[PDB]
Design a binder for this molecule. Structure first.
Ligand SMILES: Cc1cc2nc3c(=O)[nH]c(=O)nc-3n(C[C@H](O)[C@H](O)[C@H](O)COP(=O)(O)O)c2cc1C
Ligand code: SF4
Ligand code: SF4
Ligand code: SF4
Ligand code: SF4
Ligand code: SF4
Ligand code: SF4
Ligand code: FES
Ligand code: FES
Ligand code: FES
Ligand code: FES
Ligand SMILES: [Zn+2]
Lengths: 156, 560, 642, 92
């Protein structure tokens, strides 16, 4: 019994030309692309599920696993890479035990390496839920990760 | 302004009067372009709002402006009546700015722009040495233009070129003037746009399409998004003029969903143009119909290819196909499609407003116009700059960007991302052109620039670019799909200090195969970094085969 | 047109699409790995490089022009072609001994010809998929990503269950979410296998079961499909041969088969039963139009796609199942041997018959189904010249069949058999046959009394959708999932293109022509079967009739965090949607995970993640034992867990 | 079982029988053998493809009269090799 998905499909008129936009909306709502959701979308649009799967796994914005509570985005652009982004990625791995494209056991953290964020003056750059932290290093990345970990752990 | 053009003329004149009124008064512009927001520009805007509201002295006005070319100089704020440019404006000193400057007007020395070359602070950005060393032809009204305002764009003489084209000129003359101006495709190829417009117009078909490629074509460049966030209506007007010239009734703008501000700005510009009648079923009552839509890019570097872009727009996987039949004949849904870069469309209205001789006054005989770049890497001043098509790399690196940060030295420069070239100091004194350096194994590219310093291992640079290309390959043809990963494996072996001369020979011979046999441009230029570094930095590869790494960053052997 | 190939005058053709095809028409071959089947396209292999005006380019995308100088062989082109082939072979699962394309693989032949004796590149690892849950077996480690199967499934079969996924080095042809092919909407027609140029797509081989059965003490009974005899001769590279079935009988009896029957007898029986059923439907004008149920691929397709037409499907089971049920339930009693003692072997040209034999409604009737290729393998193992085998007739009482029964092997066979049965029962004044499209034929039939109907024959799945959407003036519709009927089945010898299928149809027609009795009633054995065993309607219904059920995916596929493979548990699901994420849900999930980390030593509690449960606006939701809570939190889920 | 990079590919009796017998899987686990690969001489040795038919030994001894290759070890470790696994280029 899907309602929001039906609203999106009706808004875009069950047209394949708008499949990517529909999938972006569905991800924004569900935070990822569940198999059931796009199975329903395929049934409604008369498009085989394999087609939607091929489209979804081709573009980066689409994720097949739930996004982490604190989604981490580490720029891998040229400037950020020569500025020390691999060190940032290694620090993130050693701290949270994950590599880009993965999520933690409790969905607390997720990681994805992206292109230039338009802030090369702050290379290397990391983004967490829209909060950008520039001029990063291994020590700074580890320190901020611990701080956010404690902050979330508090709950209260 | 919805029936005749004289109403639009009167509307523009009164909007100009209103803009002059507001400009003469005290107004605040905070650069909300990408990079400045990363530094806290939006929080600065919030601080300005709250401080100016509690004091309740609004006849002040607060406005959002686009990139001003000094992204690295903190969030940017300037006041109009006294054109004082403020840099590194934190949300904590906003009340100080309001009290000292907005109310009284005393210059604030502590919050001005330093001069990287002369080591001094100048109150006005227009008086800065970097500003004078540049050539602003596309970017205009730096720091004093409202990105989200069709009213402001009209008040700055905007949309006049489209009206001139519609009421006065006929598509043939428009295409003729575009051809005469010599404008070349800013997307990187450099193909003459006028010839492309001829190809699209001559195509046999009643329905045609105009497609704008918003992609940067580089994972280290932010020119197109910055231009979109600066003056979206400029690109909008260029696209409308192109659709009129090639006789199209529908246009698509392809902006990445990863860029929320660019998408929002272009959507708002489109809605404003439609509301004001610039877009709709009857533009200015001349029998010409045209509408524009923004299509979200879900993220795929291969979508910069024309065929892949067309497949992506239509809702399929961005898979390129053998170019003939060309998109100029059969593009979107088999119909003729004009595909150009954002900067090309931005240039179009500028050429139309000016002449052909006036346009050619800037640049070279074969490359007229200007090019907007995005310089990065360790430099005193980094951000978006515009230069004439005759400038050298030294001018940009030192005189415009201020040079390198203390304790750093020049090694090499990347000019077009992975598809670009790696240039050493032997090409620094070579004027930029689509022809002068297209033969010395170099290319201007989409407009991205990244400087490489002595502490950078170039084998690692090649490895990084090949890793990117291996990730971005669509996987259709054997050469790119397989060879990119194999070459990345070889380069990784080189980085891990376990390579050999056999690996070097294999890489050199596989690069030729990838370059020649690949289907589309992604795989064709995939081995460009390898070829560039081996032609310019062979001794570093040899040292790596010996476990030396003169640069010494890539941690594979140390403290033994 | 005149062109210069390697410096010699060559005349290609007047109008041509590309240089490669023009030269191939001339007789000049350029190595390539694109033209691999009838569903092939050009541009992916990149191996057809030629040199023209200095620059190298692919000849498949090069439009020829008058007097063009083209060099098809230069040291640079040799280097590039060998590099491309080595790239393909580096990541290819090079185990040809156990491959189904061994000896008929273009990649293998090129590796031989190109003298590739060692891999200069690294055999990098991929996230390969190995699906063996269906008679169609997927092994993506042998896939060359030609895409022929995708085009076959989408454009030719109209199902589209397999597609390209991911990109770059990780590009893979697979089902959605790597779902097992048995669990998807795949109809198992086997056409993708028929067109696959590598071992990536293959048929499940069940020769071991047959051999262990023959070695046992059970009575093995074989029954051969009509279209198996029309194509088996290709595997041995010999010419067409009528009487193929009888020398097959001789060979099967030699290798230990106690009885061998003809599935054409089952086809005659099915045609008789379906003709009577269709006549009843006509006289009542109900449950029309009627669909033939002889093609299991079409039956499964209808169950997946046309749940409203399941009542229109013929109740009669397919010839394989009908004859097998007759054997197991009547012949066993006549022989005084328990049904467990009989081992039934079916030789079919179809992969969907393997699925049909394993259906719940057909459980235990057909023990194993072997395709034409597996039968050819059986013959080749013995190394006896089948051409020299003296034929002997099928075994009684299910050995003879009418020409109409043997016509089942190609499209339009069952419709013609039904027409013959009706004509014999009640004459047919005339039949007018039209051909709206290539694979669609419509017949207008007038009976002697005066009542008339319309019947359509559709071969090739995917043409059914348009016909059903636009044509509503028929009473009976024959649907065959494969082009040309069963002569082009999934299990037929490779290659399996249209020319060989037409030749197979011609061979089957020639075999039909030499049959004396023309209609099922003339089959004395069938009438004896009706008079002695199927005399009453109750036994006939339980023997020859089956029921069909709708198919719908049942995907739960909830996010797994701390799953428990089995055993009674609590299966707590935490919603991970945006609205629920907006306040708490993720914190609640973390707290519950840490709770089961400190408590819950055993698998009593199963912590799951789930997507939006359509209960937004009612605070974060936490599903417990498939129950809605609303306003959930750690304590509110602990209390319920108590 | 790597026929793509084998010199008998297309003219191997074992390959043809594997094709004909319908051997699409092996329930017998692939045991590990101390295989010998040699590349020192124009004549290349690879005992992992050897079926221990003994034809090469007879050819070398009876026909050519050199007898530099012979059966060594026994049982599962049976191998046709040179004395002390010496590289061919260093033997007679
Ligand atoms: C991998 C790849 C990425 C590309 N990215 C861009 C891009 O981001 N922007 C652009 O204008 N052209 C890009 N191009 C080039 C266009 O696909 C193509 O040249 C198009 O015709 C641009 O038209 P223009 O020359 O008028 O700008 C790319 C090409 C390739 C092969
Ligand atoms: S070169 Fe790369 S991106 Fe281009 S078609 Fe081939 S595989 Fe795709
Ligand atoms: S598809 Fe099979 S026969 Fe062909 S090369 Fe691969 S493993 Fe060998
Ligand atoms: S067997 Fe038929 S339906 Fe199934 S994947 Fe292959 S072509 Fe598609
Ligand atoms: S499975 Fe077979 S037909 Fe399909 S793409 Fe792979 S090799 Fe081609
Ligand atoms: S048409 Fe014949 S071979 Fe094809 S799926 Fe149907 S029964 Fe099987
Ligand atoms: S015993 Fe000798 S001839 Fe026989 S397979 Fe082994 S190496 Fe070859
Ligand atoms: S390269 Fe990372 S923000 Fe520009
Ligand atoms: S984004 Fe503000 S100066 Fe560039
Ligand atoms: S035949 Fe394959 S790319 Fe030309
Ligand atoms: S987001 Fe949880 S019920 Fe919808
Ligand atoms: Zn190094």
């Amino acid at each position: 019994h899907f309602e929001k998905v039906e609203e999106i499909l009706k808004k875009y008129g069950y047209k394949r030309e708008n499949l990517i936009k529909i999938l972006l909306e569905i991800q924004e709502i569900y935070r990822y692309l569940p198999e059931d959701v796009i199975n329903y979308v395929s049934t409604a649009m008369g498009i085989p599920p394999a087609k939607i799967y091929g489209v979804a796994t081709f573009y980066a914005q689409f994720s097949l696993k739930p996004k982490g509570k604190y989604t981490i985005m580490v720029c891998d652009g040229t400037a950020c890479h020569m500025a020390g982004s691999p060190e940032v990625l290694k620090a993130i791995e050693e701290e949270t035990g994950l590599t880009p494209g993965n999520v933690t056991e409790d969905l607390m953290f997720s990681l994805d390496q992206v292109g230039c964020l338009g802030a090369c003056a702050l290379a290397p750059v990391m983004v967490i839920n829209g909060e950008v932290y520039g001029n990063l290093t291994a020590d700074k990345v580890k320190e901020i990760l611990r701080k956010i970990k404690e902050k979330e752990r508090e709950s209260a | 302004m919805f029936k005749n053009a004289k109403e639009f003329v009167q509307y523009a004149n009164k909007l100009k009067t209103l803009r002059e009124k507001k400009l003469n008064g005290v107004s605040i512009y905070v650069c909300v372009g990408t990079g400045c927001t990363a530094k806290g520009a939006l929080k600065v805007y919030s601080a300005f709002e709250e401080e100016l509201k509690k004091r309740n002295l609004l006849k002040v006005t607060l406005n959002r402006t686009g990139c001003c070319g000094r992204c690295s100089s903190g969030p940017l704020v300037k006041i109009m009546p006294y054109r004082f440019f403020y840099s590194n404006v934190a949300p904590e000193d906003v009340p100080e700015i309001v009290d000292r400057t907005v109310l009284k007007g005393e210059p604030i020395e502590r919050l001005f722009l330093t001069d990287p070359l002369t080591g001094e602070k100048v109150p006005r950005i227009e008086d800065t040495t970097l500003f004078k060393n540049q050539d602003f032809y596309i970017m205009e009204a730096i720091g004093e233009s409202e990105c989200d305002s069709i009213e402001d764009y009209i008040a700055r003489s905007g949309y006049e070129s489209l009206v001139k084209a519609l009421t006065s000129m006929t598509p043939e003359e428009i295409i003729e003037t575009v051809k005469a101006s010599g404008l070349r495709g800013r997307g990187g190829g450099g193909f003459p746009t006028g010839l492309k417009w001829e190809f699209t117009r001559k195509a046999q078909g009643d329905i045609k399409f105009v497609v704008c490629n918003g992609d940067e074509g580089d994972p280290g460049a932010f020119m197109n998004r910055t231009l979109l966030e600066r003056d979206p209506h400029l690109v909008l007007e260029g696209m409308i003029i192109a659709g009129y010239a090639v006789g199209a009734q529908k246009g698509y703008a392809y902006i990445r969903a990863e860029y929320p501000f660019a998408v929002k700005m272009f959507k708002k510009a489109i809605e404003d143009a439609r509301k004001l009648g610039l877009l709709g079923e009857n533009i200015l009552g001349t029998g010409f119909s045209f509408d524009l839509e923004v299509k979200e890019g879900a993220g795929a570097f291969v979508c910069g290819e024309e065929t892949a872009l067309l497949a992506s727009i239509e809702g399929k996987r961005g898979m390129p196909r053998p170019k003939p039949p060309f998109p100029a004949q059969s593009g979107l849904w088999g119909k003729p499609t004009l595909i150009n870069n954002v900067e090309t469309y931005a240039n179009i209205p500028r050429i139309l407003r000016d002449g052909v001789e006036n346009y050619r006054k800037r640049g070279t005989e074969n490359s007229p116009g200007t090019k907007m770049f995005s310089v990065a890497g360790p430099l005193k001043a980094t951000g978006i700059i515009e230069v004439e098509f005759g400038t050298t790399l030294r001018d940009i690196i030192y005189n415009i960007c201020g040079g390198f940060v203390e304790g750093e030295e020049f090694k090499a420069v990347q000019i077009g991302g992975p598809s670009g070239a790696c240039l050493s100091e032997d090409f620094i004194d070579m004027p930029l052109d689509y022809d002068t350096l297209k033969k010395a194994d170099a290319m201007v590219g989409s407009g991205g620039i990244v400087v490489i310093t002595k502490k950078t291992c170039m084998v690692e640079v090649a490895r990084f670019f090949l890793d990117f290309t291996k990730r971005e390959s669509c996987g259709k043809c054997v050469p790119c799909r397989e060879g990119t990963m194999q070459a990345y494996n070889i380069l990784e072996k080189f980085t891990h200090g376990k390579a050999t001369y056999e690996d070097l020979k294999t890489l050199e011979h596989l690069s030729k195969t990838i370059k020649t046999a690949s289907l589309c441009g992604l795989g064709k230029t995939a081995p460009n970094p390898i070829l560039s570094t081996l032609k310019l930095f062979r001794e570093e590869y040899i040292a790596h085969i010996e476990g030396e790494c003169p640069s010494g960053m890539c941690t594979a052997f140390k403290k033994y | 047109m005149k062109i210069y190939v390697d410096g010699r005058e060559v005349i290609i053709n007047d109008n041509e699409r590309n240089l490669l095809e023009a030269l191939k028409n001339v007789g000049i071959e350029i190595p390539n790995l694109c033209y691999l089947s009838e569903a092939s396209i050009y541009g992916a292999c990149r191996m057809c490089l030629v040199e023209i005006n200095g620059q190298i380019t692919t000849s498949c995308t090069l439009k020829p022009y008058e007097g063009m100088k083209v060099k098809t062989n230069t040291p640079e082109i040799y280097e590039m072609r060998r590099n491309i082939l080595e790239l393909i072979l580096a990541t290819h699962n090079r185990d040809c001994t156990t491959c189904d394309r061994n000896g008929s693989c273009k990649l293998q032949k090129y590796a031989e010809d190109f003298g590739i004796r060692k891999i200069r590149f690294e055999a990098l690892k991929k996230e390969h998929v190995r699906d063996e849950s269906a008679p169609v077996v997927r092994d993506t480690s042998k896939c060359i990503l030609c895409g022929d199967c995708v085009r076959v499934c989408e454009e030719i079969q109209g199902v589209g269950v397999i597609e390209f996924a991911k990109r770059g080095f990780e590009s893979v042809v697979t089902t959605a979410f790597d779902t097992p092919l048995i669990e998807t909407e795949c109809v198992l027609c086997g056409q993708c296998v028929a067109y696959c140029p590598t071992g990536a797509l293959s048929i499940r081989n069940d020769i071991d079961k047959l051999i262990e059965a023959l070695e046992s003490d059970k009575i093995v009974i074989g029954m051969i499909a009509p279209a198996v005899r029309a194509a088996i001769q290709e595997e041995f590279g010999i010419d067409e041969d009528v009487a193929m079935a009888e020398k097959l009988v001789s060979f099967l009896k030699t290798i230990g088969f106690d009885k061998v029957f003809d599935v054409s007898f089952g086809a005659d029986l099915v045609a008789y039963e379906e003709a009577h059923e269709f006549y009843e439907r006509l006289k009542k004008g109900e449950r029309l139009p009627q669909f033939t149920s002889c093609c299991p691929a079409w039956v499964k397709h209808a169950e997946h796609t046309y749940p409203q037409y399941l009542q229109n499907l013929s109740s009669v089971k397919s010839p394989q199942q009908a004859l097998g049920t007759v054997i197991k339930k009547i012949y066993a009693r006549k022989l005084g041997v328990p049904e467990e003692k009989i081992f039934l072997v079916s030789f079919m040209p179809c992969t969907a018959k393997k699925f049909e034999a394993e259906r719940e409604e057909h459980e235990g009737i057909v023990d194993i189904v072997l395709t034409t290729r597996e039968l050819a393998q059986l013959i080749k193992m013995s190394r006896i010249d089948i051409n020299r085998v003296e034929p002997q007739p099928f075994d009684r009482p299910y050995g003879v069949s009418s020409q109409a029964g043997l016509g089942f092997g190609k499209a339009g066979g069952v419709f013609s058999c039904v027409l013959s049965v009706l004509n014999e029962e009640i004459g047919i004044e005339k039949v007018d046959v039209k051909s709206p499209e290539d694979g669609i034929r419509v017949a207008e039939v007038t009976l002697k009394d005066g009542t008339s109907f319309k019947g359509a024959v559709i071969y090739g799945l995917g043409k059914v959708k348009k016909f059903l959407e636009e044509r509503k003036d028929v009473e009976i519709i024959e649907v065959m999932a494969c082009n040309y009927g069963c002569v082009g089945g999934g299990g037929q010898p490779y290659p399996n293109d249209s020319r060989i299928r037409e030749h197979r149809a011609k061979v089957l027609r020639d075999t039909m022509g030499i049959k004396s009795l023309l209609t099922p009633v003339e089959n004395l054995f069938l009438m004896k079967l009706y008079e002695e065993d199927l005399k009453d309607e109750h036994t006939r219904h339980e023997i020859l009739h089956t029921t069909y059920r709708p198919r719908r995916r049942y995907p739960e596929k909830d996010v797994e965090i701390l799953p428990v493979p089995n055993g009674e548990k609590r299966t707590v699901k935490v919603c991970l949607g945006t609205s629920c994420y907006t306040k708490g849900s993720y914190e609640i999930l973390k707290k519950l995970v840490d709770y089961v980390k400190e408590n819950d030593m055993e698998g009593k509690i199963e912590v799951l993640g789930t997507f939006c449960v359509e209960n937004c606006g009612a605070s974060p939701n936490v599903i417990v034992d498939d129950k809605i809570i609303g306003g959930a939190t750690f304590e509110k889920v602990l209390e319920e867990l108590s």
